[PDB]
């Protein structure tokens, strides 16, 4: 038995959203053991509240926990981009229970633009001993999550053997992905260079790299 | 690192079993009977599914069970279905507040496991004259698509700079990710070599890079 939770919220930078979970007599309205958890998808949930309103170490003092009858409210002011995650709560009830919330997505609004840096390496010493020549085209620091990528033998695009990951969000908030074209040490000898062409929101950005003088 | 640790992953193919470990300290998890297991499907709400060591909730099928050996925990799962796939969390009272586990990935497997491939790079000139030297670690064709990477500076563990993306899945079917260490020149021109360390399947492969004079 689910503990109810809006499935949305948002709020603008530095706005407050007040996001609440509502039980019964028998669990949030029952004790004062109510948690919430906030989570980026593919990371473990963080524990930001316990006991209705007790902050771990660590949890900013902008997360404010409450309970009246049987809601209980996470409020979190001051809204940073850090804050844009799932926000679940939890409540002990009688006989060993635990219920949980099914979770309120809050959106942190209007988030800045920014572009990718890209960082272009040829292949490393390693991998062409072992007879491998791998290039990577780190995509970083991009906002909003969607890039396109297209590589060039010289001028002339490269049709096979690119991969590009599905960008994911990362500790700064702003997106990661890396495009990697695996070549055969002759194929990279062969070419005067590659270039990694990163389209983001219209713009291009592109890198070149050659063989090794050294 | 959480308070419990937990293996990062577990799989097991449908029907095999597995155990998942919950290791802590004498204070907590090895003072008392109080470890839970909680399970999490990505984009739901966690469930307990054991209290106490080894109590079942209500609808929790025996196929699931929880027990203890001084400091560590450790829950089974017999005969894998396809809804058990799910990240695993434990938790345990300490000397009385709740100490938790990282969580463990357990996938039920759905094409043949397949280990990493692992490419590290040292700054490419470019941004080396940029004044960078992020190096990056790609991590490709590996299944199931659960990774851990740690990085080291010398012999000595490096947190800070490091970011990792998330595992998708390529055209191959096969998943890939890249780690990447973004290190000032002084940082990487003073240290005998950095490495990058990738867990997959309960086992680790290790890069290294050093500085060159020429790049």
């Known amino acids: 038995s689910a503990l109810t939770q809006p499935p949305s919220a948002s709020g603008s930078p530095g706005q407050s959203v007040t996001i609440s979970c509502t039980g019964t007599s028998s669990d949030v309205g029952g004790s004062d053991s109510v948690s919430w958890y906030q989570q980026h998808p593919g990371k473990a949930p963080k524990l930001i509240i316990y006991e209705v309103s007790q902050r771990p170490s660590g949890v900013p003092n902008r997360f404010s926990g409450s309970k009246s009858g049987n809601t209980a409210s996470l409020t979190v002011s001051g809204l940073q981009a850090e804050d844009d995650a799932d926000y679940y709560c939890?409540?002990?009830?009688?006989?060993?229970?635990?219920?949980f919330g099914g979770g309120t997505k809050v959106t942190v609004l209007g988030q800045p633009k920014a572009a990718p840096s890209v960082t272009l390496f040829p292949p490393s010493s390693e991998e062409l001993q072992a007879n491998k020549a791998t290039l990577v085209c780190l995509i970083s620091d991009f906002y909003p999550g969607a890039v396109t990528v297209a590589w060039k033998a010289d001028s002339s695009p490269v049709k096979a053997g690119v991969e590009t990951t599905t960008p994911s969000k990362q500790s700064n908030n702003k997106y990661a992905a890396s495009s990697y074209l695996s070549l055969t040490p002759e194929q990279w000898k062969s070419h005067r260079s590659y270039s990694c062409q990163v389209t983001h929101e219209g713009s291009t950005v592109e890198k070149t790299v050659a063989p090794t003088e050294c | 690192?959480?308070?419990?640790?937990?293996?990062?992953?577990?799989?097991?193919?449908?029907?095999?079993?597995?155990?998942?470990?919950?290791?802590?300290?004498?204070?907590?998890?090895?003072?008392?009977?109080?470890?839970?297991?909680?399970?999490?499907?990505?984009?739901?709400?966690?469930?307990?599914?054991?209290?106490?060591?080894?109590?079942?909730?209500?609808?929790?099928?025996?196929?699931?069970?929880?027990?203890?050996?001084?400091?560590?925990?450790?829950?089974?799962?017999?005969?894998?279905?396809?809804?058990?796939?799910?990240?695993?969390?434990?938790?345990?009272?300490?000397?009385?507040?709740?100490?938790?586990?990282?969580?463990?990935?357990?996938?039920?497997?759905?094409?043949?496991?397949?280990?990493?491939?692992?490419?590290?790079?040292?700054?490419?000139?470019?941004?080396?004259?940029?004044?960078?030297?992020?190096?990056?670690?790609?991590?490709?064709?590996?299944?199931?698509?659960?990774?851990?990477?740690?990085?080291?500076?010398?012999?000595?563990?490096?947190?800070?700079?490091?970011?990792?993306?998330?595992?998708?899945?390529?055209?191959?079917?096969?998943?890939?990710?890249?780690?990447?260490?973004?290190?000032?020149?002084?940082?990487?021109?003073?240290?005998?070599?950095?490495?990058?360390?990738?867990?997959?399947?309960?086992?680790?492969?290790?890069?290294?890079?050093?500085?060159?004079?020429?790049?």
């Open positions: 939890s409540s002990y009830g009688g006989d060993n229970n635990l219920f």
